């Protein structure tokens, strides 16, 4: 074979590993000051608690136990079945069964627990790509996360992906049997401890636009694992926190705010260290004085010992005056970071009893920030995940066959998909605004048929199978 | 035998014991500053009280006395019985009897009391695996918890488990009779005191994908205990607090926040030690002065003694100035840890009378954190537990036989499963939104049949056996 | 400049008079609750004590922070 792997994947991995190195060190920097174990352990938990809340508060809105995508009938299909109501009813029933299948798959296949780490890592790193390869209908298809450190990607100036490579080091103890043999014959006498790196390369076929995979184990192949992928659906997904116009990767959310994060840690730790000095009781006996250490060190309470106070002092550094200046600043940054990590208690920074309304106003800002990040993250990670899972399930045919109208639907996400839809809110607000013109349903020179429409128009309902057609209006008026 | 135990389990235990050693020391560190007896006794209880609340507050939502899983009819089975209502009713009745069986089993078999320690340990340690081996319908099947220290596990880069080993040291006084003989018929005259380590090895059969067990007692076997396990259902469960992309184990929740926990202990204990010094009354008599200790030490109140005040002083270290600097920081960390241990009283950190609303906002952040951790922990520990118990009970046939439609159901957990379902909330909100279009049930040119659907669509009800079918609509209109 | 300033205020440096009896080693190593030979006068700490200027800087940083915020 040739193409983009003219001489293996390792070669392509090393070539891109130089473009990735800035993002990689940036990610390790962010991790150090927040929670390091995502790339020893820091002097504050402020950043840590923030990142934790940011992941929680994100996924609980993005990936809750509620159904959070709604498949809508394709526009042409909707048009083709116009005002054929029994069928359209059954179609929604069909896709809204699909709604449940993928969800009941996700909750059982343990996608959520990994998507947590995915968001955590996607926040501190900027990129963190996901494999959901083998449905294997019978058993667990666990999701697999490849953190920024142990993978690499290349893109074109548009956004499209050409080639990605992922390294996995497992030590030959926990290898599948096909590679265990393809390894121990070409290599040496291996042990469970040693450690083997299995690269994985995906090209874009340079004419028949489709992704091709193979698995390299030291300038070799797996002698079996190589499979194909269409461009539209690839079970190998590279997400992106904070896009850039070109490049290949994306910016850690927790970067622009690090300027202060670093400022806080290197200060916080000095304060903690300072406190540890203030707390230390050391007693300075004048060796020229009469008061001798032992008689005190051993003396219990209520005693009387020979000596005067002047022979003894205690360290008493008394630099509160500086401390208060350091603290007053540590809290000022802690507050700014708090607001930047969606952390309620941005509202309370001591002072006075912040009154009841400048809470629900500061709240609206925090909700705006989370909502903006939510919409981007939702739109980018949420839809690629759904589109891939939909195609995978259609291929295995765990989707008991549908009518023609539900082979290619559209994929509403976020609010619309859960109960509290705005489609709905528009619908019910119109119905009530229709109840409004009851006191003139017996209209002397007032045309309800027209108003009843213009209202639904301004609100923006479909008005399809709603306003009884001129013919159906006249037909029903006689009954 | 051979496979993954080419020469016993002890060998595999020792090989993996080196990969486990970092997690193990990390766990002992966490424990030291929280509650140490989970791996002498510390100077503060803050962390202790936090871990306690964290376990309580978790399990009370995860594992309450209420029924907290609901088995739903498999999707194909639902489709196959579409609009056959008497049967579907009876099906729900059937699984909702299964709902009660497993629960009545769990409450009687004392699962909750162990699952407490499981969560406590899973919080401080990162992993803590669970055995629920023998149903023994007649009596107690107690749950068995193997703490991180006395077990070990290996995984593949996917999540799947290959081999686990558990050590149990009991001293030959409390051994079953088969090992008691298989032990003293190899190794020595043994007393009730001595102490015997029984290892326990589980392979993945390297072609007929199924878990195989045996029980080793010193490079030997139990001569009986060896049994098999299918891959889908193993009564040997390894949970995971905070996943990692690879490895084998998981991260203690109480790790990233330790950075401050350690900082607090080593300070707190200095303060306590400082206080004990401040409280100590030592009286310094000048031996050159006239005032003599005896006369005072023995003198009662209201007396008059010969001497002047200048001959006597008291220790008076007077380093409040430093203390206030130390305290002001101890409380600042105490507050950040409190928030990180779901501890209400995160809201009150003295200052002023925190007003009425920036409580229910700081609450929403604490509920979000607990809710996120809950969803992961629920999804990971809750569903593996249920799936295992369901299969075990089906095998012993304590599940009086069901129709074909309830051999492989789906397993809803969390909110859906208890009364307050979102499925329910959507249903009732639609029904009321339908009551909304009563003032136009006598519709002049307004099609209710269509609106009454589109509402249930936007909300996301099934609409199955709800909107009377075109034929059933026309059939009932004549009656 | 404030962040930098704080970093200076936080820094604990202890000035032993080399003419005095109180010697660094015995303190640096001494744990809490101890007694060491020497007097307080031989030792001080840096104590820059320019809060007076800080407060003037802060009161202005926050005034601009407020206008930018809006």
Author numbering:
A (entry chain C), B (entry chain D): 5 to 43, 55 to 494
C (entry chain B): 285 to 354
Quote the paper:
Phage portal proteins are key viral components located in a single pentameric vertex of the capsid and they act as initiators of capsid assembly. They are also critical components of the DNA-packaging complex and are involved in tail assembly. Here we report a number of crystal and high-resolution cryo-electron microscopy (cryo-EM) structures of the T7 bacteriophage portal (gp8). The structures show two conformations—open and closed—of the portal and suggest a possible mechanism of the channel valve that regulates DNA passage.
The gp8 monomeric structure was then used for phasing the gp8-12mer 3.6 Å resolution crystallographic data (gp8closed, see Methods section), which yielded an atomic model of the dodecameric portal. The overall shape of the T7 portal protein shows a ring-like assembly formed by 12 subunits and with an axial central channel. The external diameter of the particle is 170 Å, whereas its height is 110 Å. The diameter of the channel (measured between opposite Cα atoms) is 23 Å at its narrowest section, which would hinder the passage of a B-DNA molecule. Regarding the shape of the portal central channel, there are two cavities, “upper” and “bottom”, with a conical and an inverted conical shape, respectively, separated by the protrusion of α10 toward the center of the channel. The electrostatic potential of the protein is markedly negative, both on the external and inner surfaces, except for the exterior of the clip and the tunnel loop, due to R368. The tunnel loop, a singular feature also found in other portal particles, is between α9 and α10, and only partially observable in the gp8 dodecameric structure due to its intrinsic flexibility. Therefore, two clearly different conformations in the T7 connector were defined: one closed (gp8closed) and the other open (gp8open). Although the first structure described in this work (gp8closed) would impede the DNA passage through it, the second structure (gp8open) would allow it. The closure of the T7 portal protein, as observed here, does not allow the passage of the genome and therefore the portal valve is likely to be in the open conformation during DNA packaging.
